[PDB]
């Protein structure tokens, strides 16, 4: 079944990604090219995995959706050095995403 | 062609095998890393070590070990800690230091 909440999370997921021009966070960090990634990051996350989760009914409340967004950001800050395109992008995403998530949660908790 | 040169050849290939990503196989590319020489006084890599070896410039084991240690220390110096490069050098310090320990025992008999 397709609910209003799922529809809202779809919209929210797309809003979080508009803030990401380089598609830095669109797909999993490629482990072939980044072979040390799993030595430092326990639970990788990215926007495509989130969409898979969303469409498979794994985000039945707002907290679990926000948790995975927050993992995208915190994993990136953790893995990358500060003086990088990637770390700077995650700082910006924290800022811009925090705001999108604030208004979406307000809408969700009325359902 | 001495037993010593043959030993260093074998040792060098063993060190290279520890670097699965071939990060240290060739000099750091100055066209991609233009400020490298402003930080690093004496660049080193496994191909340069092979050139030195084949041109008889490793008179003794200490000189060879010194160059291996440079590959590692240069990389820790130049790069930020949270990089593939730095992390790889930290692993190479351990795994390569061990290769050198066993090879030195053999060298010192010659």
């Amino acid at each position: 079944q397709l609910t209003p909440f799922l529809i809202l999370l779809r919209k929210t997921l797309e809003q979080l990604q508009e803030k990401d021009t380089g598609n830095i966070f669109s797909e999993p960090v490629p482990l072939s090219e980044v072979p040390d990634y799993l030595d430092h990051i326990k639970k990788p996350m990215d926007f495509f995995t989130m969409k898979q989760n969303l469409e498979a009914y794994r985000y039945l409340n707002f907290d679990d959706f926000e948790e995975d967004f927050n993992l995208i950001v915190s994993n990136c800050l953790k893995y990358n050095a500060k003086d990088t395109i990637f770390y700077r992008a995650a700082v910006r995403l924290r800022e811009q995403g925090g705001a999108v998530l604030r208004q979406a949660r307000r809408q969700a908790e009325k359902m | 062609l001495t037993p010593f040169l043959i030993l260093l050849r074998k040792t060098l290939e063993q060190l290279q095998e520890k670097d699965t990503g071939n990060i240290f196989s060739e000099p750091v590319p100055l066209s991609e890393v233009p400020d490298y020489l402003d930080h690093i006084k004496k660049p080193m890599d496994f191909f340069t070590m092979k050139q030195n070896l084949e041109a008889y410039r490793y008179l003794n084991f200490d000189d060879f070990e010194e160059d291996f240690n440079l590959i590692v220390s240069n990389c820790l110096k130049y790069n930020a800690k949270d990089t593939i490069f730095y992390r790889a050098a930290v692993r190479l310090r351990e795994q390569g230091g061990a290769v050198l320990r066993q090879a030195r025992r053999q060298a010192e008999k010659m």
Partner: peptide
């Protein structure tokens, strides 16, 4: 450290 080599992994 210098400017860095950039990139993500290799």
């Amino acid at each position: 450290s210098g400017r860095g080599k950039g990139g993500k992994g290799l």
